[PDB]
From a paper:
The structural basis of the bifunctional substrate specificity of PaTrm5a is interesting but currently unclear. In this study, we solved the crystal structures of apo-PaTrm5a and PaTrm5a in complex with 5′-methylthioadenosine (MTA), S-adenosyl-L-homocysteine (SAH), and adenosine (ADN) respectively (the chemical structures of these ligands were shown in Supplementary Fig. S1). The 38.5-kDa protein is composed of three domains: D1 (M1-P60), D2 (N70-S162) and D3 (K163-S333). The four structures of PaTrm5a reported in this study all adopt an “open” or extended conformation distinct from that of Trm5b.
To gain more insight into the mechanism of substrate recognition, we soaked or cocrystallised various nucleosides with PaTrm5a and determined the 2.2-Å crystal structure of ADN-bound PaTrm5a, which shows clear ADN density in the map. The main chain of the Val244 forms a hydrogen bond with the N6 atom of ADN. However, the RMSD of the D3 domains between the two structures is as low as 0.89 Å (over 100 Cα atoms). The large overall RMSD of the former may be attributed to the completely different D1 position of PaTrm5a, which adopts an extended conformation in all four structures. Compared to the ADN-bound MjTrm5b structure, D1 in PaTrm5a is displaced as far as 80 Å. In the complex structures, the MTA-, SAH- and ADN-binding pockets align well, and the network of hydrogen bonds that stabilises SAM is maintained completely.
Residue numbers in the entry: -15 to 333
The structure:
């Protein structure tokens, strides 16, 4: 006596060799459809030409019951190994070129996605998820808003949170991107100055945020750092960060919750001042006034204004009766024709 047909029908060992041929304009719809009905073959790649897309299917009868055109095609197997090293490898150039720079903060990936390629959201996420399998949050970014310069962010994939712990230069940085400002790309800078700093210095860091700069400096050198931040949530996270990194800091950090322009005139002077100035803000005079040996003044300057920028720094140096050497460095490419720069000011004796 024999087997039931509805038991036999699943015994075939061969691979699926067919697919469905659809117009490109239908391709997303159909993909969804195939996934929903449950006949989408994950083992094979989809291919396309200039007019049509072909999706691999696991049941051609059901495919025909969906009114789709069944074709016999040898489709590429899915890759098992992964050799992509950057996002451009995982996206068409027309999509990738409109994307902003991708940033990783802890287990959060942040990318800017213009409205015109927003329909392609799902491939973008996919690519990101493929490049960074460890991240658990993908958020679309806008601009910085308000006095605290908090980045506009919308979670578009993963856990519905914008808080995490970021590892940098040997320190741990608790961050909440919905409540505080933070830029990971300053890593280099923060390390650099940390290496320049000598033991015994008194250092001032205005606009300190969740104190990544004081944390790195104090991580590598036995110094005292004053940090000034006006955002109380950032202050809170800064305290938690100070407590989190306490047993790995050589230096000391004093956190001051307040307005830089109010606090600094009531502070004593320092050996070194490090000013991660908010974009558009001019704190040159005030930060220089608190520096006795070195100022590191960050700013955003247009390509054709660098010279003028340097000149103005020198002017301020003369204005405060200081004799200085001024060096201007391009820290990063901020947007076209616009650089994030740093004025290294050596105050001479
Ligand atoms: N007058 C200010 N005083 C102290 N911190 C400030 C001031 N303006 C901006 N910030 C902080 O500087 C950081 C970088 O812009 C942010 O955390 C922001 O809240």
């Amino acid at each position: 006596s024999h087997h039931h047909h509805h038991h036999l029908e699943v015994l075939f060992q061969g691979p699926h060799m067919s697919g469905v041929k659809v117009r490109r304009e239908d391709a997303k719809k159909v993909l969804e459809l195939l996934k929903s009905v449950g006949i989408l073959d994950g083992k094979r790649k989809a291919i396309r030409d200039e007019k049509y897309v072909i999706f691999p299917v696991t049941d051609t009868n059901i495919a025909k019951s969906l009114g789709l055109e069944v074709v016999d095609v040898e489709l590429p197997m899915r890759p098992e190994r992964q050799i992509y090293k950057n996002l451009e490898d995982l996206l068409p150039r027309e999509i990738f070129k409109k994307l902003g720079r991708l940033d990783i903060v802890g287990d959060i990936a942040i990318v800017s996605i213009p409205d015109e390629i927003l329909s392609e959201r799902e491939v973008i996420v996919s690519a990101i998820r493929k490049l960074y399998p460890k991240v658990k949050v993908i958020a679309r970014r806008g601009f910085h808003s308000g006095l605290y310069r908090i980045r506009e962010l919308e979670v578009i994939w993963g856990e519905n949170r914008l808080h995490t712990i970021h590892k940098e230069n040997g320190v741990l940085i608790k961050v909440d991107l919905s409540k505080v400002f933070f830029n990971p790309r300053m890593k280099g800078e923060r390390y650099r100055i940390a290496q320049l700093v000598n033991d015994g210095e008194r250092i001032l860091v205005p606009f300190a945020g969740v104190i990544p700069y004081p944390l790195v400096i104090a991580r590598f050198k036995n110094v005292e750092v004053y940090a000034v931040e006006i955002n109380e949530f950032a202050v809170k996270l800064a305290e938690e960060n100070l407590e989190l990194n306490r047993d790995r800091l050589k230096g000391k950090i004093k956190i001051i919750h307040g307005d830089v322009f109010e606090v600094l005139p009531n502070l004593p002077n320092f050996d070194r001042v490090v000013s991660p100035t908010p974009k558009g803000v001019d704190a040159l005079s005030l930060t220089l006034s608190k520096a006795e040996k070195f100022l590191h003044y960050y700013d955003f300057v247009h390509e054709s204004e660098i010279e003028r920028f340097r000149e103005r720094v020198l002017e301020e140096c003369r204005r405060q009766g200081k004799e200085c050497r001024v060096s201007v460095r391009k820290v990063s490419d901020y947007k076209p024709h616009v650089y994030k720069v740093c004025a290294d000011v050596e105050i001479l004796s």
